[PDB]
């Protein structure tokens with residue numbers, strides 16, 4: 001028996017969410033459906049143009065941890081906030097979900113990361129992220145005991161943007177594999193992949209990463225192809241297990257030559273896609289650390305993703321464990 | 331032509347919203363459906379026990395100003411926040427809605443007011459409010475030109491809790507009436523009425539307040555009676571116009587001997603009652619300042635309130651002006 005099922009590591013972010021029309025994205029040169037990194041000046045400018053908003057704790061890996069805890073798994077999180085009101089909100093929300101979170105802030109400045117997320121009528125989300133205190137995450141924030149005691153350590157591709165987070169991840173990989181644990185990553189975003197293609201391929205091919213999460217766009221970006229079948233063949237060769245999501249078209253889990261297709265749950269209406277991939281990783285990794293079949297890990301993933309897209313905000317406000325029980329995934 | 335249809339004045343608050351079971355309220359001695367005032371220590375204690383939450387700009391009168399602007403009216407607001415992140419969120423949200431908001435923060439401590447709002451399965455909301463920077467609102471915050479240029483100035487009974495806000499209101503009343511404008515108040519909360527019963531009756535009877543908003547419990551509390559009929563008769567004698575809401579039973583508008591009964595709108599589900607009375611006031615005052623009949627003012631009131639109770643959070647995330655046109659209220 002181990003202390004944690006899943007440790008996640010990522011950029012600690014509070015989301016600022018508003019709806020906009022499609023013209024708003026064009027006028028503000030915001031790349032639709034993408035993570036757009038912005039500086040402090042652009043953050044102020046975009047906020048000045050944004051409509052009334054709501055705030056919720058975010059961060060891709062933060063969301064994933066919360067989702068694991070929600071399903072009933074034991075989760076931990078590494079990520080760096082500031083000693084400010086946004087940081088206090090982030091700390092409260094993740095701990096309140098029952099996730100182990102002990103990363104200390106290093107001061108009030110830079111302030112806690114925030115992402116302005118614009119949700120269009122089609123439910124798509126376009127994020128505009130000021131990293132703030134995330135730039136300070138480094139090897140000093142690795143709780144070695146936690147990595148040692150976690151069945152899976154999962155991290156964001158997004159961590160390659162701040163300067164020193166990658167060093168922390170390399171320490172995690174070493175500790176995890178020394179203790180017979182597994183390392184997992186999400187490719188995060190297709191432009192993220194564009195930025196760090198060589199590095200991400202290295203992580204997988206050298207076996208520092210065991211389990212890779214991607215959506216169709218990220219997988220195409222990774223191999224700079226328009227051929228999805230090529231991309232699936234290549235990703236399966238480059239990592240031990242790949243879980244590749246295809247929105248409404250479901251998911252496919254790959255292992256060597258094995259392929260496991262999973263249906264997406266049928267939706268009433270796509271409210272806000274924010275958090276879909278994160279909560280897919282929640283369900284998959286909850287399943288995985290419970291010893292479930294890869295198909296069942298896929299099903300748990302699709303269940304969690306389907307639920308999170310029917311609400312505003314990235315972390316489900318309802319019981320995932322109860323939804324899983326009702327679904328006979330249990 | 332004047333600058334504003336409706337100026338509102340109230341406690342500037344950011345809401346922190348979470349769902350709980352009925353047992354949570356009993357365990358924590360939270361009065362259900364009430365506004366519970368708390369000190370800084372109790373705030374910390376309740377937050378530590380609260381689940382994962384979302385944040386949204388609140389404040390009764392702030393919500394009402396936002397609603398009027400949403401409907402297409404011209405609104406202004408007075409309320410005091412701190413120079414902190416929470417205050418920046420509040421300032422952004424109200425201004426982003428098109429409400430004139432120019433109240434200057436006086437420093438970073440006390441910090442911006444927050445209310446932890448617990449929503450139970452029945453959709454009722456129980457609020458736990460730390461007034462923070464609201465205690466600093468006073469006469470210096472009255473923008474006399476704004477009061478002079480507003481058709482109606484509306485304020486919260488809740489303003490009787492901080493020490494000096496009442497002086498600001500007495501100044502508003504004088505300026506408004508000297509310029510031939512009208513004053514309005516909401517009784518806010520039944521326990522608030524208990525605290526300031528005589529003060530509120532004096533405001534009405536002296537003619538400082540022209541239009542009074544109440545729900546059934548506030549009206550009963552005002553006259554310390556269980557006889558709703560007696561309550562309606564007395565409230566009509568004590569003010570020029572009373573608008574009394576009755577939840578699913580709709581509302582009744584009273585003027586002298588006149589009575590106008592309005593039905594509540596049909597709804598999918600009571601998701602969260604937070605802001606229902608605030609947004610009734612929004613619809614009613616929008617109508618009132620557009621020259622509409624008392625009955626149509628009530629209809630616009632019921633439409634706005636019915637919309638806000640089907641969403642999480644106190645300020646509608648949809649277009650109230652579109653719903654009004656759709657409902658044929660124009």
Ligand SMILES: Nc1ncnc2c1ncn2[C@@H]1O[C@H](CO)[C@@H](O)[C@H]1O
Pocket residue numbers: 010011013014015035057058059060061063115127129156158159161274275276277278314
């Ligand atoms: N650069 C980033 N790194 C990690 N997470 C991010 C980034 N930008 C946005 N997010 C988070 O992505 C989540 C949706 O997957 C949102 O909750 C948002 O907080």
Ligand SMILES: Nc1ncnc2c1ncn2[C@@H]1O[C@H](CO)[C@@H](O)[C@H]1O
Pocket residue numbers: 340341343344345365387388389390391393445457459486488489491604605606608644
């Ligand atoms: N003491 C208070 N004064 C004014 N508004 C409050 C108070 N407590 C809670 N609220 C606000 O009441 C609104 C719902 O009517 C919520 O948005 C909340 O912010």
Ligand SMILES: Nc1nc(N)nc(-c2ccccc2)n1
Pocket residue numbers: 315316317318347348349350381382383384642
């Ligand atoms: N208790 C609780 N747990 C989660 N995950 N979310 C909530 C919640 C409910 C409504 C609004 C915001 C958060 N509440």
Ligand SMILES: Nc1nc(N)nc(-c2ccccc2)n1
Pocket residue numbers: 017018019020050051052053054312646647648
């Ligand atoms: N543009 C916009 N306007 C309002 N009134 N509300 C929102 C909003 C949408 C989603 C979440 C929070 C606020 N957005």
Ligand SMILES: [K+]
Pocket residue numbers: 272273274275308309310311312313314315
């Ligand atoms: K969502």
Ligand SMILES: [K+]
Pocket residue numbers: 602603604605638639640641642643644645
């Ligand atoms: K509401």
